């Protein structure tokens, strides 16, 4: 878990 | 106690009242100013109305029966005409 959810 | 049923051909089809109350339309025939009661079925011929009355004795006898209910036989030559009478009588 590094980045956020996709737009 | 009995309901006098006449067909388009003038045939007489007196049946018990509890059998004839299965169909909704006949219940409307026996209600109102209609209340042996004479009922007019000028559009229903006798050959399809006989099978309607056979269903009434078949319907009432087979209510909540535990055994496997046999299917009501409706011949191919009458089935289309009987279907219209089934809708109109709300049977």
């Amino acid at each position: 878990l590094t980045r956020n959810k996709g737009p | 106690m009995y309901v006098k049923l006449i067909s388009s051909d003038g045939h007489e089809f007196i049946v018990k009242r509890e059998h004839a109350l299965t169909s909704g339309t006949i219940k409307a025939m026996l209600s109102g100013p209609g209340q042996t009661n004479e009922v007019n079925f000028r559009e229903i011929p006798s050959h399809v109305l006989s099978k309607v009355c056979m269903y009434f004795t078949y319907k009432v006898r087979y209510t909540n029966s535990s055994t496997e209910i046999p299917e009501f036989p409706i011949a191919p030559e009458i089935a289309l005409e009987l279907l219209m009478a089934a809708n109109f009588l709300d049977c």
């Binding site: - | 106690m1 009995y2 067909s7 051909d9 003038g10 045939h11 007489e12 089809f13 007196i14 049946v15 018990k16 059998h19 042996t36 011929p45 006798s46 050959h47 399809v48 006989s50 009355c53 056979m54 269903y55 009434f56 004795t57 078949y58 006898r61 087979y62 046999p70 009501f72 036989p73 011949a75 191919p76 030559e77 009458i78 005409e81």
Partner: protein, 97 residues
Amino acid sequence: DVFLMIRRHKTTIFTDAKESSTVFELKRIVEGILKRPPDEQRLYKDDQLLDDGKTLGECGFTSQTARPQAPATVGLAFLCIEPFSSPPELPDVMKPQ
């Protein structure tokens, strides 16, 4: 149980009686609606007279042929049984037209 219909000219009574029930009380059932004397009335299955003493099941009206959906018919005479109608005969289709 036995389910049957009676026809004289155009009448049809969808009454029922037990397999051991006799013609005597069955004939009195007819008097309930037809309001006619029972002794004058006579019944006719397949051109054959029925005695009032014998039961309905003794004359051949067994439960196997007296189902509610396909009741067995018996004529009534005070025979002029009027047929209901001829249903519209569907084309055989498979037969060459």
